[PDB]
Amino acid sequence: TNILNRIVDHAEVTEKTGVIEIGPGIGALTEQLAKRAKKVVAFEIDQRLLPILKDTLSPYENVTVIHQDVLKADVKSVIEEQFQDCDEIMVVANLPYYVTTPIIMKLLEEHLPLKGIVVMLQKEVAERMAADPSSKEYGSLSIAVQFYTEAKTVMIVPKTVFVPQPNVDSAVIRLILRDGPAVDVENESFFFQLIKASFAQRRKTLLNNLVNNLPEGKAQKSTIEQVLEETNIDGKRRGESLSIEEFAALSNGLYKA
Amino acid sequence: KRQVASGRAYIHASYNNTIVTITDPDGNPITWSSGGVIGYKGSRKGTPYAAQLAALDAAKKAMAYGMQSVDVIVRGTGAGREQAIRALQASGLQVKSIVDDTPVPHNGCRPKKKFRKAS
Amino acid sequence: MRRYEVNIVLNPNLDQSQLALEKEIIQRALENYGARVEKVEELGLRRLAYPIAKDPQGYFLWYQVEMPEDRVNDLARELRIRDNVRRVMVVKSQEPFLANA
């Protein structure tokens, strides 16, 4: 246990700050969290596990319990409901891995006025690590989770806290939601489509990806090659080299042609 | 309606379902049958009981056309082969010849994942 | 300059004229490539184990030739041009190994 202290330290939580917890479970997290924040609100789903939670949190009064999932709920509604005087909001969810991946994004495209998230992930998928372009870890997911925020892994964790014994190591990643988009965007839809078209076959050359994966494409060989020429991107360069600024520029190029 | 009076029967006995079809010597089918027409749905369609029923269903819609003599050719490796056989044998019909015609590949196309790991 | 056996399977549904014509066509083709026939045997018509070109019957001819090796393939290519011939098979003539003494 007691990892909670170090995670909270990396949360930079203050008294003025409020906290949202998505997978509180037994409330051990909430326990050590309570002594640091004025407002803590917990989303909860398990009808079975709720009664045991209700009585255990009796000592601390600053807690709030909400009985619907993050998926089918308006987070902004809760923020306006409870966080009226609070300065900024952190999130310290430690829920099972297979659930965490969509919800983190979902909180991001909606562009809530929340600053950052501190969350537990698998080591390998640490928002695909630092998302430095020339790496294996670099991906479409990375492009998503740096288009909206600045992420870095503060530390990792072997061994176990909750489960008896896992097989893989875990990490903790810390976030700040950025004020605006990284670079000007003509469309979100086209941009995201271009990302998936580039990353559909990672090993294949960028030119092949654009020609094949992107709709039409076969009729626009000359057009695609020309536009990538004015973009100052080499045809044989792979998707894993292009960066955010690059993809922006390429997306701008591809539209209006 | 055909009054061919003598045809051949085909039994496709799969793992999940059993289908029987009667046809003329030419090869134009006159009627069939299936666990589905009986009224059974889901797993029970594969269960031999539905075979015990569609068995004679063939026969009946066949007496309906006035056929007497039958040739039986069976396919597949369903659990309900043999009991379906004894069935359309004692549905009231004179069976001439019964043959197994389960089609096997001569190491051709690659099967499902479920049907790999063969040594 | 080796010895080979040639098996020809052709259409049984022929009269004297057509089948004869086919015989001299095959003979001429075989002769042109510098081959030399030694024995010719004609087993007429034998039931086929399975239909070949939608016919449960065929006419078999057997040739014992000896000729240069390099041309062999070429001959096999030419004997298959006729629509009547159904199967062509050229094999090295090898010694009759006997068992069950």
């Binding site: - | 010849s97 | 087993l43 184990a49 190994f97 069950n100 003494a101």
Partner: protein, 69 residues
């Protein structure tokens, strides 16, 4: 009993003597194992080749249909 014993002298490499070759075939068009045929290693191997040759020529069946229960 084994097939080999209950026969006369014959040729293995002769891919045309059908009435001896069929007796090396099962009710289905399959080559019998060494157990059923009682042949030595080399003669079995050459017999397989002869079977394949005659079988391609159309004298022997690729398969047959067992008539039983």
């Amino acid at each position: 009993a084994k097939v080999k014993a209950t026969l006369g002298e014959f040729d293995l490499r002769d891919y045309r003597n059908v009435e001896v070759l069929k007796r090396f075939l099962s009710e289905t068009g399959k080559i019998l194992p060494r157990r059923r045929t009682g042949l030595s290693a080399k003669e079995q191997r050459i017999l397989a080749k002869t079977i394949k040759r005659a079988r391609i020529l159309g004298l022997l069946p690729f398969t047959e249909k067992l008539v039983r229960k």
